[PDB]
Amino acid sequence: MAAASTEGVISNKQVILKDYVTGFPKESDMQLTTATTKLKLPEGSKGVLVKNLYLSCDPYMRSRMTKRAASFDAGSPIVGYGVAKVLESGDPKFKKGDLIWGMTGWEEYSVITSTESLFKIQHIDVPLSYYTGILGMPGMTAYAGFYEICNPKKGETVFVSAASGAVGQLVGQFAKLLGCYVVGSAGSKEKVDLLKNKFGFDNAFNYKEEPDLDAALKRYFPEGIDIYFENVGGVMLDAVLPNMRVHGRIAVCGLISQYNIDEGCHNLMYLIIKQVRMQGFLVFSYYHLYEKFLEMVLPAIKEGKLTYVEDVVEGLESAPAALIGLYAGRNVGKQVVVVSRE
Ligand X SMILES: NC(=O)c1ccc[n+]([C@@H]2O[C@H](COP(=O)([O-])OP(=O)(O)OC[C@H]3O[C@@H](n4cnc5c(N)ncnc54)[C@H](OP(=O)(O)O)[C@@H]3O)[C@@H](O)[C@H]2O)c1
CB 148 → ligand X: shortest distance, Å?
Answer: 12
d(CA 137, CA 166): 10
| 254 is a contact residue toward ligand FER (CB under 6 A) | yes
Interface with ligand X by CB under 6 A: which range of 69-77, 105-113, 120-128, 164-172? 164-172
| 60 is a contact residue toward ligand FER (CB under 6 A) | yes
| 233 is a contact residue toward ligand FER (CB under 6 A) | no
Least Cα distance to 77 among 50, 49, 109 occurs for 109
Among 20, 147, 287, 327, binds ligand X (CB under 6 A): 327
| 59 is a contact residue toward ligand FER (CB under 6 A) | yes
d(CA 207, CA 227): 18
Site string for ligand FER, 265-284 (x = CB under 6 A): -----------------xx-
Are 81 and 60 in contact by the 8 Å Cβ rule? The answer is: no
Q: Where are the alpha helices (DSSP H) in the chain?
A: 61-64, 137-143, 168-177, 189-197, 213-220, 235-240, 269-273, 290-302, 319-325
| 260 is a contact residue toward Na ion (CB under 5 A) | yes
Q: How far is CA 215 from CA 179, 205, 218, in A?
A: 25, 12, 5
Site string for ligand X, 179-218 (x = CB under 6 A): -------xxx--x---------------------------
Are 251 and 231 in contact by the 8 Å Cβ rule? The answer is: no
> 324 — phi, psi (to 5°)?
-60, -35
CB 170 → ligand X: shortest distance, Å?
Answer: 9
Residues that bind ligand X (CB under 6 A): 58-60, 138, 141, 162, 165-168, 186-188, 191, 231-232, 234, 253-254, 256-257, 281-283, 326-327, 329, 331, 334
